[PDB]
Amino acid sequence: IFRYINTTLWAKAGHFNKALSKGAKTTTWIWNLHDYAHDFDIQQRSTGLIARKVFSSNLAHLSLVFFWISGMHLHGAYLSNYDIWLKDPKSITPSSHLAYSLIGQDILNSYTSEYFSGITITSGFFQLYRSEGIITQSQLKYACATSLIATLICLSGSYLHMQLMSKFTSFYKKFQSLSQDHLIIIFGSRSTSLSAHQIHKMLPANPLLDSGISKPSILQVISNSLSYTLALFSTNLSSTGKLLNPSTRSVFLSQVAAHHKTTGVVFITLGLIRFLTMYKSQFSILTSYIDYHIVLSINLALIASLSIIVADHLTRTPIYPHKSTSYPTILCLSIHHAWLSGFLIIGSGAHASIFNLLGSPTSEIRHRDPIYSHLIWVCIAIGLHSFSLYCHNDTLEALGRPEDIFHDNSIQLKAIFAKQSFLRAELQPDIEMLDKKIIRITQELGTADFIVHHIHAFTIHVTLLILSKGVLYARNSRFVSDKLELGFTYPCDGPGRGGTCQISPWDHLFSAVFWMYNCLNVVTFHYFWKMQSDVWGFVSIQKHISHYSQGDFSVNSITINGWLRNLLWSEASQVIQSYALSSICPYGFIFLIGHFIWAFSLMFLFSGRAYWQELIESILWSHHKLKIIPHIQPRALSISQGRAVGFIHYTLGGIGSTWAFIISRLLVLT
């Protein structure tokens, strides 16, 4: 069985694809080898190998994630100031990340504690550890050990399943079994397990810390043995979320444990219900969507939506102790999950297109013109409406006519449904604050919030237009009637019919990545400006609030010039003036590098490969002149690869620019 696991193919690069068997005649062979590496569908051998590869690769990636978790745990146990952060979280910035004293890189470590200098981490791992009752270094040691053991176990399982599974293997196709066991045993039987963990280790510990005994009598009290504290020790009646814990500025962990217990019960009951529930309508979906790419797209869309829900729920539904006051942590936790939501949504669209090209589509593709046409009209309507309210405000403010602009002190567009959406939270008529820092105050939504929400809707709709147009017009179109034979990813069909560049679903993803990036850059900026202007900030003992941006949002965000001046210029002073400043030197440098990479992408985005091919031939003349012949013949990047490289550099550079801009400012202000 395992005697066929041989290294003889390690030296034979490109073995998996039969199109690469001719050998590396040109440099295009290298890029094709890298491109087809994970494309198990088109690789050689039967369908059973596809299942084995998919499952074992999933296990290998799971081992990789476990290794990353183990690295974070070891950094927290042996390369961090988590001790002093535990003792005083409101005066110590989290830091489990040092820099070596080479090339003066010592300037990157900054004062986080009197005994520690390092890079302020914004992953929120310290708050997670405190919410996980991790106090001693031994606990982090054993967490790291368990994560390393999990890495080894998952790696070994990925190794084994390449030969345990065979041609007869069918457990992956049993979707009823997968859904039932997943749902019940994981969402139900593991949620209650975490509820048990919290009830037996957090409530014995986190109340002890909040009770002021950071000593906890060392292990005499902290090491469990506290069955005289009661599970609902400090619920204080009320409703979950209406009253926060005054000490840690978060929801009481007893309520979180009850939530996990009840959610596990609900999931178990739903698994029991699924024995007899509503069906026979999603049944066409049931039979037509049993394929790798469709389920991958469905899961990607679902996980991305969950990621955006997490992004919006991690900030002003504070669960973690001492996390609402840690403003850089809140900002990072929102924005990182926002970006992941966008990226995984785009991936869902791509794999929907791939499923359409490999499998057979459904009924909705036959009236695709009305669908992707009313989508076009709605995109045009909300683009010519949302953005232009900004253009109108801008023009009339430049003209000196502020009474004719869309503002609160002018023609005002009230957010009617949001203002009547006091259902969410429904907190008492005041704010909450822990230590000179605002925990959460209700965002008073006005005209600017209305306009920016419509901008969000417009960008979302345009990205969805690109994605659905790629998906629905994958097999064929009025433009080209045999797009199915062209495959999933192709540069074009030729300069004929006026020009057929970028008709493939791959190119539709290529444009959709740009539009998703543009969509949630505005989301990032809206969050980053709104929180600073209207939520975060200092306090005055006379109940007066001094925010970080001093309420710039409601008065400046009504015009594009307001965004340019009060957000991208005034709030970029921290990152731009960050040279020789200990903590924020890398952020200024990375700001510069992000600008460089973003501009560098434009060389690939704007140019075609024929010019570069001719230039490469001109250079190859000089190489052949001096008897330097590369027998792997130099070829310029393929059209699809040029577009991919351009998109990757564009998004990476822009994301790095925002990343530095937000993080350096929040680190300086805090």
Q: Which does 167 bind (CB under 5 to 8 A by kind): other proteins, ligand CLA, none?
A: other proteins
Site for ligand CLA in 303-332 (CB under 6 A): 313, 317, 319
What torsion, rounded to 10 degrees, do the Cα atoms 554, 560, 566, 569 define?
Answer: 170
Cβ proximity of 344 and 307 under 8 Å: yes
Quote the tokens at residue 653: 């550079």
User: Does 464 participate in binding ligand CLA (rule CB under 6 A)?
Assistant: no
Quote the tokens at residue 486: 């062209």
User: Does 45 participate in binding other proteins (rule CB under 8 A)?
Assistant: no
User: Does 87 participate in binding other proteins (rule CB under 8 A)?
Assistant: no
Q: Of 50, 84, 196, 380, which lies in the binding site for ligand CLA, with binding defined by CB under 6 A?
A: 380
Instruction: Give whichever of 134 and 346 is closer to ligand CLA, judged by the CB atom.
Output: 346
Q: Which does 509 bind (CB under 5 to 8 A by kind): other proteins, ligand CLA, none?
A: ligand CLA
User: Does 473 participate in binding other proteins (rule CB under 8 A)?
Assistant: yes
Q: Which does 212 bind (CB under 5 to 8 A by kind): ligand CLA, other proteins, none?
A: none
State the nearest-atom distance from the C-beta of 605 to other proteins, in Å.
5
Site string for other proteins, 592-631 (x = CB under 8 A): -------------xx-------------------------
State the nearest-atom distance from the C-beta of 474 to ligand CLA, in Å.
12
Q: Of 123, 139, 189, 263, which lies in the binding site for ligand CLA, with binding defined by CB under 6 A?
A: 263
State the nearest-atom distance from the C-beta of 187 to other proteins, in Å.
19
Beta bridge pairs of residue 633: 26
Reported as half-sphere exposure (CB side, CA atoms, 13 A), residue 164 has a value of: 9
User: Does 170 participate in binding other proteins (rule CB under 8 A)?
Assistant: yes
Residue showing tokens 């989508």:
375
Site for ligand CLA in 549-608 (CB under 6 A): none
User: Does 198 participate in binding ligand CLA (rule CB under 6 A)?
Assistant: no
User: Does 66 participate in binding ligand CLA (rule CB under 6 A)?
Assistant: no
DSSP secondary structure code for residue 404 in this structure: G
- Mind spelling out the 3-state secondary structure of 508-573? HHHHHHHHHHHHHHHHHHHHHHHHHHHCCECCCCCCCCCECCCCCHHHHCCCHHHHHHHCCCCCCH
Choose the binding region for other proteins from 123-131, 166-174, 245-253, 424-432 (rule: CB under 8 A).
166-174
User: Does 8 participate in binding other proteins (rule CB under 8 A)?
Assistant: no
Reported as half-sphere exposure (CB side, CA atoms, 13 A), residue 102 has a value of: 3
State the nearest-atom distance from the C-beta of 121 to other proteins, in Å.
34
Residues 6+ apart with CB under 8 A from 293: 41, 351, 352, 354, 355, 358, 359
Q: How far apart are CA 53 and CA 575, in angstroms?
A: 45
Ramachandran class of 14: left when φ > 0, alpha when ψ lies in -120 to 50, beta otherwise: left
Instruction: Give whichever of 380 and 669 is closer to ligand CLA, judged by the CB atom.
Output: 380
Helix (H) / strand (E) containing 438: strand 438-440
Q: How far apart are CA 334 and CA 332, in angstroms?
A: 5
Q: Of 226, 244, 268, 379, which lies in the binding site for ligand CLA, with binding defined by CB under 6 A?
A: 379
Site for ligand CLA in 135-164 (CB under 6 A): 153-154, 156-157, 160, 164
* Number of helical H runs and strand E runs in the chain: 23, 4
Q: Which does 482 bind (CB under 5 to 8 A by kind): ligand CLA, other proteins, none?
A: other proteins
User: Does 163 participate in binding other proteins (rule CB under 8 A)?
Assistant: no
Choose the binding region for other proteins from 36-44, 86-94, 233-241, 397-405 (rule: CB under 8 A).
397-405
Q: How far apart are CA 333 and CA 339, in angstroms?
A: 10
State the nearest-atom distance from the C-beta of 404 to other proteins, in Å.
7
State the nearest-atom distance from the C-beta of 289 to other proteins, in Å.
13
Q: Of 104, 212, 400, 429, which lies in the binding site for other proteins, with binding defined by CB under 8 A?
A: 400
Site string for ligand CLA, 510-549 (x = CB under 6 A): -x-xxx----------------------------------
Choose the binding region for ligand CLA from 126-134, 186-194, 238-246, 396-404 (rule: CB under 6 A).
238-246
Max intra-chain CA distance, the chain: 88
> H helices of 108-252, where?
125-131, 137-164, 175-181, 191-197, 206-210, 219-222
Residue 522 CB: number of other CB atoms within 10 A?
15
Instruction: Give whichever of 437 and 565 is closer to other proteins, judged by the CB atom.
Output: 565
Instruction: Give whichever of 232 and 365 is closer to other proteins, judged by the CB atom.
Output: 365
Choose the binding region for ligand CLA from 31-39, 101-109, 268-276, 539-547 (rule: CB under 6 A).
31-39
Q: Of 12, 87, 367, 424, which lies in the binding site for other proteins, with binding defined by CB under 8 A?
A: 367
Site string for other proteins, 267-296 (x = CB under 8 A): -------------xx-xx--x---------
Instruction: Give whichever of 46 and 622 is closer to other proteins, judged by the CB atom.
Output: 46
Cβ proximity of 418 and 445 under 8 Å: yes
Choose the binding region for other proteins from 141-149, 174-182, 449-457, 660-668 (rule: CB under 8 A).
174-182
Q: Of 572, 565, 458, which Cα lies nearest the Cα of 522?
A: 458
Q: Of 76, 75, 80, which Cα lies nearest the Cα of 117?
A: 80
Cβ proximity of 455 and 522 under 8 Å: yes
Quote the tokens at residue 533: 């202007």
- Site for other proteins (CB under 8 A): how many residues? 81
Quote the tokens at residue 5: 């696991």
